[PDB]
Design an enzyme around this catalytic site. Structure first.
Site, PDB file in Angstrom:
ATOM      1  N   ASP A  92       9.951 -11.297  -9.833  1.00  0.00           N
ATOM      2  CA  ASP A  92      11.236 -11.302 -11.542  1.00  0.00           C
ATOM      3  C   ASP A  92      12.944 -11.699 -10.703  1.00  0.00           C
ATOM      4  O   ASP A  92      12.962 -12.337  -9.761  1.00  0.00           O
ATOM      5  CB  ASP A  92      11.936  -9.652 -11.518  1.00  0.00           C
ATOM      6  CG  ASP A  92      11.782  -8.660 -10.389  1.00  0.00           C
ATOM      7  OD1 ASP A  92      12.306  -8.901  -9.690  1.00  0.00           O
ATOM      8  OD2 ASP A  92      11.102  -7.304 -11.582  1.00  0.00           O
ATOM      9  N   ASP A 269       2.814  -6.648 -15.835  1.00  0.00           N
ATOM     10  CA  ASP A 269       3.206  -5.523 -14.809  1.00  0.00           C
ATOM     11  C   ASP A 269       3.081  -4.931 -15.559  1.00  0.00           C
ATOM     12  O   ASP A 269       4.145  -5.113 -16.346  1.00  0.00           O
ATOM     13  CB  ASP A 269       4.170  -6.416 -13.898  1.00  0.00           C
ATOM     14  CG  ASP A 269       4.741  -6.704 -14.732  1.00  0.00           C
ATOM     15  OD1 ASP A 269       5.319  -7.411 -15.358  1.00  0.00           O
ATOM     16  OD2 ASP A 269       6.205  -6.084 -14.303  1.00  0.00           O
ATOM     17  N   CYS A 307     -15.601   3.846 -12.982  1.00  0.00           N
ATOM     18  CA  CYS A 307     -14.595   3.544 -12.324  1.00  0.00           C
ATOM     19  C   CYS A 307     -15.569   3.012 -10.642  1.00  0.00           C
ATOM     20  O   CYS A 307     -16.369   4.566 -10.490  1.00  0.00           O
ATOM     21  CB  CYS A 307     -13.498   3.945 -12.222  1.00  0.00           C
ATOM     22  SG  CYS A 307     -12.252   3.392 -10.592  1.00  0.00           S
ATOM     23  N   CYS A 309     -13.762   1.965  -8.184  1.00  0.00           N
ATOM     24  CA  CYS A 309     -13.444   1.933  -6.942  1.00  0.00           C
ATOM     25  C   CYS A 309     -13.337   3.112  -5.554  1.00  0.00           C
ATOM     26  O   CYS A 309     -14.819   3.715  -5.878  1.00  0.00           O
ATOM     27  CB  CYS A 309     -11.516   1.823  -7.462  1.00  0.00           C
ATOM     28  SG  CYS A 309     -11.263   4.391  -7.415  1.00  0.00           S
ATOM     29  N   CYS A 312     -13.372   6.625  -6.494  1.00  0.00           N
ATOM     30  CA  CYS A 312     -14.283   7.812  -7.292  1.00  0.00           C
ATOM     31  C   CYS A 312     -15.665   7.213  -6.562  1.00  0.00           C
ATOM     32  O   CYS A 312     -16.645   8.336  -7.212  1.00  0.00           O
ATOM     33  CB  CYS A 312     -14.775   7.051  -8.322  1.00  0.00           C
ATOM     34  SG  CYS A 312     -12.642   7.628  -9.528  1.00  0.00           S
ATOM     35  N   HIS A 338      -6.714   4.435  -7.480  1.00  0.00           N
ATOM     36  CA  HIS A 338      -8.085   4.702  -8.587  1.00  0.00           C
ATOM     37  C   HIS A 338      -6.879   3.799  -9.775  1.00  0.00           C
ATOM     38  O   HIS A 338      -7.456   2.875  -9.992  1.00  0.00           O
ATOM     39  CB  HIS A 338      -8.278   5.527  -8.760  1.00  0.00           C
ATOM     40  CG  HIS A 338      -8.690   5.791  -9.873  1.00  0.00           C
ATOM     41  ND1 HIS A 338      -9.916   5.785 -10.065  1.00  0.00           N
ATOM     42  CD2 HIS A 338      -8.383   6.865 -11.394  1.00  0.00           C
ATOM     43  CE1 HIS A 338      -9.379   5.644 -11.407  1.00  0.00           C
ATOM     44  NE2 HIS A 338      -8.980   6.601 -11.790  1.00  0.00           N
TER      45      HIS A 338
HETATM   46 ZN   LIG Z   1     -11.691   5.194  -9.335  1.00  0.00          ZN
END
Ligand SMILES: [Zn+2]
Ligand SMILES: [Zn+2]
EC number: 2.4.2.29
Lengths: 374, 374
Positions: A92, A269, A307, A309, A312, A338
């Site tokens: 930025d 973002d 999810c 990820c 999880c 996560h």
């Molecule tokens: Zn997850």
């Protein structure tokens, strides 16, 4: 290979999916850009952030020039070395944090402010911001602008917008004056104008006359409420050049994102997934949940049963619940990993549904499930 | 206040409960002494060990003289500073580890050995061991002896026992020759004699003629099997002075302990709860369990549903299972804390049941449940 190449693979209404090709990598659009730190034991590992789906991370110029300073970063080999991230990095301008964390003096020339942790003097301007972002060695550069507080009068908004456009030209000139930067990095211009359609339009074509690789929609996420934000985006985005990425800065609630993609935004973002990760809030497809609740003390299910990820696929709500309550650092790390992964998966679903022409249905299915909780 | 005062509050058969009063604190008998480390982030905190029930911890002289050496420990303020433990500390002679980890030369004078990690030369003898344990500043001192490997011939056993008794006298003389040590610390003698009743008897009265604050039963836990060990203890313990603590070195399986208390033992030590804690084995009232098993992946119950330790009041088998499988350090720490606490609770139940005259019934109830698993 290319410095900056934006392609649109598919469209559905104002929504659009594609890629941004840069020398350090490809960015899949629409994109979410998590905020990078410094690659230490206190923050998530770079490889972990990468494994969540991030194609590009964001760096706060303002904080980086305060500690350890842009000059140090340059000697250390730039932000990519400092953050252990060899893929594209957006920085930025550092102007927003200045007008909400620092200002000893402000004018058309620029601003000079005191370090909120050292008292030392630091100067920022279109010329200086571009130079500092060069020292950090970022790939996408944000033009320095003057942010107008919310709510703002039609006079204060028109004033700050007109200045921001003159600073846009100065930012473009500074950028082009440095061959190493101009030939390898990209520059985005920011559209201001508050909630006023005429100011937005006068800002948009002002930027188009200057010309930028990408165009950010600034002035939102200052506390205007989602409905007002969508209303602004409704006319603001179409005024921006169609063949260029549309960046909506600061915005990043899951429902805010989906709605913003419907209106033509390509980049996002926000620190929400990172911030709430440590605060004990987890994002699911059925809305946010507070992990501290007694309900999750024996919940054997993962944070979200859909999810993908790594958290999880291993950790249950129960164990994460205890780690957080124990004050154990691992718990906050798991939540954060996560959360940012969940965000990237949201982006992937958006990209998928657009190219299949089923995004409009996805947006409806999303809100129905997300708002109903349960 | 007193240097070393042993009281017997109650008896039941050969079993007996009481206290050992020392200047640095009271030791409740029968006692289990966990092995201390060095007070770092890799090991359990001293306050955590204390909170488990430990009245006294053990220090390995052999390892401590190798790193960082006894002299360094003395300059640092002794073992109590080094280990962050201001309560009583027992140190072994260091002779056992020498004859199973190191020996360049061995004789009646003593032993000299090479550092198994530096190659440097170190010397141990009745005189030197006492001096080194003085430098460490321990409260209970173990006499230097010659340990006979298992299985041993009736000749090798009689030889090592006879030498150990001459070294017992030399250890006593060295101890008394140092006023700071003799007036503040205590000295235990060790009984040898393998599995031979005559050698045990000749060793016992040899020690009694010399006189020690406490008497250890050495030569066991070398791989003789529980039944043989109990058989040895059956005649070995009554030969030792009744008005003094009986220490069974190295022995520490829960069932081994209960059976040894039935035969007159007052003190125990072993690395089993610490070792198996990191290896993923947890002690319960229904026998040991391996936490890595898939059965405990979703087991919401604590390690033991009767254990009072802070781990079982918070952490489930499920979360501990994952932490261990994840290679997460916290998991091994939790297991270890529970294991040593479980041991102290076993000791407390023993002390309680003896003074209530219900220990014989407790021993039967214990084995019935412990061996049946489930
Ligand atoms: Zn997850
Ligand atoms: Zn426990």
């Amino acid at each position: 290979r290319p410095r900056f190449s934006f392609s649109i693979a598919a469209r559905e209404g104002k929504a659009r999916t594609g890629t941004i090709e840069m020398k350090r990598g490809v960015i899949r659009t629409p994109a979410f850009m998590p905020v990078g730190t410094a690659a230490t034991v206190k923050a998530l590992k770079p490889e972990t952030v990468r494994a969540t789906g991030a194609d590009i991370i964001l760096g706060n110029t303002y904080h980086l020039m305060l500690r350890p300073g842009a000059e140090r970063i340059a000697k250390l080999g730039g932000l990519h070395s400092f953050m252990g991230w060899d893929r594209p990095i957006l920085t930025d301008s550092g102007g927003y944090q200045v007008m909400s964390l620092s200002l000893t003096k402000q004018s058309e020339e620029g601003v000079t402010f005191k370090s909120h942790l050292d008292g030392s003097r630091h100067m920022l301007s279109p010329e200086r911001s571009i130079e500092i972002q060069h020292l950090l060695g970022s790939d996408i550069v944000m033009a320095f602008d003057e942010c107008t507080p919310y709510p703002a009068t039609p006079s204060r908004a028109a004033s700050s917008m007109e200045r921001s456009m003159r600073w846009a030209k100065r930012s473009r000139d500074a950028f082009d004056s440095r061959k190493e930067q101009a030939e390898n990095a990209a520059l985005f211009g920011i559209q201001q104008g508050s909630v006023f359609e005429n100011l937005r339009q006068q800002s948009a074509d002002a930027l188009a006359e200057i010309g930028f690789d990408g165009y950010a929609v600034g002035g939102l996420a200052v506390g205007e409420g989602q409905d007002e934000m969508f209303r602004v985006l409704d006319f603001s985005v179409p005024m921006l050049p169609d063949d260029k990425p549309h960046y909506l800065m600061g915005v990043g609630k899951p429902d805010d994102i989906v709605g913003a993609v419907e209106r033509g935004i390509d980049m996002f973002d926000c620190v929400l997934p990172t911030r709430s990760g440590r605060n004990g809030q987890a994002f699911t497809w059925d809305g946010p949940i507070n992990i501290r609740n007694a309900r999750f003390s024996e919940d054997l299910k993962p944070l979200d049963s859909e999810c993908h990820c790594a958290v999880c696929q291993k950790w249950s709500r129960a164990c994460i619940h205890h780690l957080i309550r124990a004050g154990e650092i691992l718990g906050a790390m798991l939540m954060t990993e996560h959360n940012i992964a969940f965000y990237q998966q949201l982006m992937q679903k958006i990209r998928d549904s657009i190219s299949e022409g089923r995004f409009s249905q996805f947006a409806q299915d999303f809100r129905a499930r997300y708002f109903a909780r349960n």
